[PDB]
């Protein structure tokens, strides 16, 4: 390990931020790979210790008009606790079957995965959600994020994947999850 190959030392730390930080987009095709085919989050956590608080944001600088609408579809997953079964469906609408058009194709994907619909809109209109919007934005804008996916850890230091082994995903993996733990014991 060696400050600029699996990691770089952010010059103005971020204090408040999360043990662990993700940022993504529903439209970004390596978030896709991250997501379905890797699962990174899921096997980060599971080599850090029990409750790390892990954080993810998506982006709005892919997409078009699309991304915010994304964002705040996002905030509306937060807000309501309903990652988890969003989160697939929105990929695969995005980037699999590109049945995601317009706002109302994102809401369509909340009504299919069980969310009434009068609790969608209210979260989607809500000041709460546009606080959560604006705090994506703001993380973003603290680290001068450039690019999905990324990871930060302690608000202190980026993970750098394209320095790490791509032709096992396994040894992928677990380079990136060890990075990880490694990075945050520092
Ligand atoms: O697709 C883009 O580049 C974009 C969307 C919001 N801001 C930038
Ligand atoms: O950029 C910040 O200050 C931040 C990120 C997650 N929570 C706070
Ligand atoms: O995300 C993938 O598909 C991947 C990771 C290592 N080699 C391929």
């Known amino acids: 390990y060696e400050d600029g190959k699996q990691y770089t030392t952010l010059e103005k730390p971020v204090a408040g931020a999360p043990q662990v930080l993700e940022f993504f987009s529903f439209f970004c095709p390596h978030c896709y790979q991250f997501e379905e085919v890797l699962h ?3 096997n980060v956590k599971k080599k850090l210790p029990e409750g ?3 954080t993810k944001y998506h982006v709005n600088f892919m997409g078009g008009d699309l991304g915010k609408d994304l964002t705040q579809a996002w905030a509306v997953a937060m807000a309501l606790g309903v990652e988890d079964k969003v989160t697939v469906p929105l990929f695969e609408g995005v980037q699999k079957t590109q049945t995601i058009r317009s706002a109302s194709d994102i809401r369509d994907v909340f009504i299919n995965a069980g969310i009434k619909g009068e609790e969608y809109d209210a979260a989607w209109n809500s000041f ?3 606080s959560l919007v604006a705090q ?3 993380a973003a804008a603290d680290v001068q994020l450039r690019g999905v996916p ?3 850890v302690n608000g ?6 394209q320095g790490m082994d791509t032709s096992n995903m396994d040894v992928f993996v677990q380079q990136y999850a060890d990075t990880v733990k490694y990075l945050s014991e520092k």
């Open 40 to 42: 990174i989050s899921d």
């Open 52 to 54: 790390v608080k892990m």
């Open 128 to 130: 709460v959600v546009k």
């Open 150 to 152: 990324a990871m930060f």
């Open 156 to 161: 202190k230091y980026q993970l750098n994947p």
């Open 136 to 138: 994506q934005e703001k």
